[PDB]
Ligand binder design. Sequence first.
Ligand SMILES: [Mg+2]
Length: 224
Amino acid sequence: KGEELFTGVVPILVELDGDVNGHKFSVSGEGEGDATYGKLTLKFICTTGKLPVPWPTLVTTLVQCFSRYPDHMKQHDFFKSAMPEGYVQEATISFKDDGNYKTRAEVKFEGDTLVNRIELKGIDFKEDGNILGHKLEYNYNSHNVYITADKQKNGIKANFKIRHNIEDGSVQLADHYQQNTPIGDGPVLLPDNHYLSTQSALSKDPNEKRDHMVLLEFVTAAGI
Ligand SMILES: [Mg+2]
């Protein structure tokens, strides 16, 4: 039944409150998703001033229900199956040789809009490390998100490594460990092992003076 809510274009709202090494900030995002094509278009704004971390470090925190699941994999789409009541998504993002983010989000429908509400806490970042030193390029590599079922929580786990390009040609690794659990009492789809193939393009709105990020993303399920 939840997949029925995604056959057309769906408006998206994202609201994040963050604290990284005591630097407090908020981000508001608006856009739309079209799961038929695994396509997301979003604009995020830092509503509190300057973002204290690089925008690319927030991309995985800032709605995998818009993935394109091929018809032959439709029985493996947990994310849509949990809608409209939604799911809780928790992650730990470990930056190699640096600090970590812990996030908690609720993703659910509010009327006909898909909403992602997030709290992010970052600790033990190095002041002149790649994150607080803002040494990351404004770009995003393509990645696979590996999904496995968590039968005991009636949900799923996801594991992946993000490779963030550093301005000097090196790479900043970020290990991601995520868990999702449904909010409602109805049944959800528990998938076989598979992955999400993601591609993301970051840009700016040339008329915008606030600190912001324009994102175009494609997400396709595969491996089955
Ligand atoms: Mg390079």
